[PDB]
Amino acid sequence: LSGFTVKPVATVYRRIPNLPDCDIDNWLNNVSVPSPLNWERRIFSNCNF
Amino acid sequence: INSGTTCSNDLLYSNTEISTGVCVNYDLYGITGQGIFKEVSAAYYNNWQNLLYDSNGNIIGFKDFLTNKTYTILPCYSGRVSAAFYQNSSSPALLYRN
Amino acid sequence: VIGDFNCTNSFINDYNKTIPRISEDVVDVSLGLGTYYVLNRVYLNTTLLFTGYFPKSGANFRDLALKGSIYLSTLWYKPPFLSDFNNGIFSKVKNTKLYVNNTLYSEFSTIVIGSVFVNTSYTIVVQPHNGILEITACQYTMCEYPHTVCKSKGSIRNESWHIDSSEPLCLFKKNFTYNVSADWLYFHFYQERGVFYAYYADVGMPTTFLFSLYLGTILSHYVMPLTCNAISSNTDNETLEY
Numbered sequence: 001l002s003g004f005t006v007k008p009v010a011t012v013y014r015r016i017p018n019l020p021d022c023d024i025d026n027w028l029n030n031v032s033v034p035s036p037l038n039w040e041r042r043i044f045s046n047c048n049f
Numbered sequence: 050i051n052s053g054t055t056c057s058n059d060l061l062y063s064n065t066e067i068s069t070g071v072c073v074n075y076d077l078y079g080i081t082g083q084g085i086f087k088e089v090s091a092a093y094y095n096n097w098q099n100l101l102y103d104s105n106g107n108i109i110g111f112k113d114f115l116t117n118k119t120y121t122i123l124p125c126y127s128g129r130v131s132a133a134f135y136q137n138s139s140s141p142a143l144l145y146r147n
Numbered sequence: 148v149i150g151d152f153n154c155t156n157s158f159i160n161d162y163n164k165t166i167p168r169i170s171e172d173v174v175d176v177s178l179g180l181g182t183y184y185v186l187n188r189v190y191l192n193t194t195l196l197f198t199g200y201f202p203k204s205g206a207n208f209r210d211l212a213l214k215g216s217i218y219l220s221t222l223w224y225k226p227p228f229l230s231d232f233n234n235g236i237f238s239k240v241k242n243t244k245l246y247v248n249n250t251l252y253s254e255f256s257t258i259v260i261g262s263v264f265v266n267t268s269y270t271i272v273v274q275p276h277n278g279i280l281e282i283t284a285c286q287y288t289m290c291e292y293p294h295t296v297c298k299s300k301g302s303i304r305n306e307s308w309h310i311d312s313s314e315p316l317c318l319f320k321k322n323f324t325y326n327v328s329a330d331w332l333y334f335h336f337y338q339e340r341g342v343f344y345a346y347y348a349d350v351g352m353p354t355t356f357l358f359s360l361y362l363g364t365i366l367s368h369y370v371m372p373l374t375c376n377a378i379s380s381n382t383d384n385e386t387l388e389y
């Protein structure tokens with residue numbers, strides 16, 4: 001008779017990232033807090049967060 | 050928005066859990082397939098090596114980069130039953146081989 | 148002529164006495180030199196027939212040295228020095244060991260791979276940093292006369308080959324380490340179906356896998372001079388072999 005099979009679910013996904021981490025928490029938790037008059041700006045580009 | 054390369058890794062990292070015993074699908078480093086997984090102790094994997102192949106070209110083992118654990122992939126069951134039926138019987142006799 | 152931006156115009160001339168040399172050794176793939184491992188596959192006790200991009204057994208090598216001190220020549224940025232990247236290249240680099248105050252420094256030439264070398268397109272740049280390579284596939288703005296200054300003993304030039312006020316869009320950026328006390332290095336660079344593959348090796352062995360980039364375009368060209376006022380065959384005998 002016809003061969004009986006099953007339908008698998010809950011697949012797995014693996015892939016190596018090509019870009020490093022943005023590391024935003026490291027700069028947000030800095031020991032130096034600038035005054036409201038300074039309001040230092042930091043730009044991030046080409047990273048994964 | 051919807052451009053550049055600065056993306057997020059939240060959707061593709063929902064579960065990141067590997068089962069051992071059940072039949073499931075897998076997309077590992079671009080290789081797509083389906084089968085069952087089993088735990089084994091392997092020490093022949095190098096720093097840049099993540100998959101294991103054979104002479105025929107199929108995948109037989111791999112190693113997870115998030116936990117440093119090796120796994121072996123085995124094909125899942127796909128068989129066929131034999132039905133022995135008489136002339137005017139009500140239900141045939143079933144035989145599952147092996 | 149590679150780029151479209153004027154970096155500097157200090158000393159530019161036309162030195163017409165630079166001819167590449169040809170080595171005397173041949174390719175020997177009997178022991179394993181010249182071949183490379185698969186991307187991320189492992190084989191145990193398997194005699195495998197692999198169809199790929201490999202160098203021909205019994206061929207000859209050619210050097211692409213562009214050693215300069217003060218004056219930069221326009222012919223160095225013109226063919227045959229700027230060859231065509233048709234299918235792939237296998238390069239062998241000599242590791243120069245400089246000794247300053249009883250320590251070792253390693254500096255060798257670099258190579259930039261591109262198609263039109265315009266900021267509107269992508270380009271792959273590798274660069275050694277005291278034993279650390281940095282592979283970046285970005286939209287760098289190349290100059291007409293790129294160069295590199297040796298940060299080991301001292302020079303008189305200013306290394307400037309990319310001009311960007313902000314960080315451009317990059318598709319890949321990664322740093323790698325190797326053995327600083329190595330003697331020779333091997334590299335493979337090829338492409339197929341719009342996918343670029345690169346392989347590196349620091350010791351004598353089959354080459355290992357670095358990365359695989361999906362670009363979608365076709366690369367047709369691929370070495371900037373190394374401005375250094377330290378290495379010279381009068382006091383410190385060191386030569387650049389690529």
Ligand SMILES: *[C@@H]1O[C@H](CO)[C@@H](O)[C@H](O)[C@H]1NC(C)=O
Pocket residue numbers: 114115116117
């Ligand atoms: C796996 O091994 C690598 C290299 O030995 C290490 O950097 C990484 O932290 C390890 N990961 C885990 C989860 O142990």
Ligand SMILES: *[C@@H]1O[C@H](CO)[C@@H](O)[C@H](O)[C@H]1NC(C)=O
Pocket residue numbers: 020276279281320321322
């Ligand atoms: C690679 O090293 C250079 C300096 O050698 C550094 O500026 C750069 O951020 C590094 N890249 C990564 C991804 O660590």
Ligand SMILES: *[C@@H]1O[C@H](CO)[C@@H](O)[C@H](O)[C@H]1NC(C)=O
Pocket residue numbers: 326327328329
């Ligand atoms: C570098 O090479 C030297 C000589 O081959 C060797 O003694 C040393 O252990 C190597 N170091 C590394 C990190 O591979």
